Amino acid sequence: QFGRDIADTTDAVRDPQTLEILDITPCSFGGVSVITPGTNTSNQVAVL
């Protein structure tokens, strides 16, 4: 009925009605950083 990964995490699943297998991928995420030349000079910022 489903597949699993090395960490025993689900990667695929058979649809309950249509016996077909759908791939699963975690939604994309990441950290956030802020760049500043110093408030002593300006107030512009850029993010990454």
């Binding site: 975690p26 995420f29 990441g30 950290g31």
Partner: protein, 49 residues
């Protein structure tokens, strides 16, 4: 979900360039590496030294 690997600041090409520049400077120049003499000491003279 929660683990991330960050890239190193210096890429491989930069490391290779640093090594190439260092070795070229040590080979072409001799005991004059550092100070910008920039003339070219013959290699056999360095070997004799």
């Amino acid at each position: 979900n929660g683990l991330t690997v960050l890239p190193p600041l210096l890429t491989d090409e930069m490391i290779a360039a640093y090594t190439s520049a260092l070795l070229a400077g040590t080979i072409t120049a001799g005991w004059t590496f550092g100070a910008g003499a920039a003339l070219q000491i013959p290699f056999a003279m360095q070997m004799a030294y």
